[PDB]
Amino acid sequence: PHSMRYFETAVSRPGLEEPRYISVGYVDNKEFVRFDSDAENPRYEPRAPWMEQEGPEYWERETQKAKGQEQWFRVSLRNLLGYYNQSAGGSHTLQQMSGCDLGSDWRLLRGYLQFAYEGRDYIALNEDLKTWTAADMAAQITRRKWEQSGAAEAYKAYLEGECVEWLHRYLKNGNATLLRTDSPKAHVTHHPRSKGEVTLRCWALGFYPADITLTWQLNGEELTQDMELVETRPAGDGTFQKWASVVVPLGKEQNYTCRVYHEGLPEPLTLRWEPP
């Protein structure tokens, strides 16, 4: 499974100050390009090593699209301000997500296009890439404007066309990088607590992609709501971490097994608390 996404944000600032526009490109959830209007020389910059392969014309063309996008968001922010009853001056947020998902066969699974205003759903292009779903009354005004101007058609053309052909190119250009997985390295920590109990914590470190599953078992039976787990978190070096813990009786630790499931592994890990 593969994907490309552009995550765009326009943030309006107090008084006279002009809005900040930021665009971030992702290939298979990894950041590959970034434009930031707050930069000294605003331009799309490479964020993945395999992007350096692109000629100077790529960067100028992409940068020019962002300069147009910045202005589009300025006029859209003003229009929304009026739909929700007001004039200029306020601090507001407009966000956009767009892109495509591909199968393992590189065929289009779906196009994707959504907007948020103040971090809440505003308008989405339905999976048919033809019709729109507005979140509220103000958004319905945009829906009718976009239905009248046939906006969905140009979105569908990019999502099924340009988006797929560029993702195919990115996937080819970043083959040695994008196909790489980092196996998790697991270990169990032992934290004696009250009532003659002990927290057994199962750690999974250094893995890529982020998707993982940690399970705890009592002599073959998997543990439900009883198990505590942290949200998967970036290690900061491109890999991720996660832990899952259970509270067990002291002296009975050897009856518990942790299992780690990750695509990067030759097979699932199985591990036990190991004394000194």
């Binding site: 996008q69 976009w146 140009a154």
Partner: peptide, 9 residues
């Protein structure tokens, strides 16, 4: 490569 919006909101 990125997409350009045309019709404003």
């Amino acid at each position: 490569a990125s997409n350009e919006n045309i019709e404003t909101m």
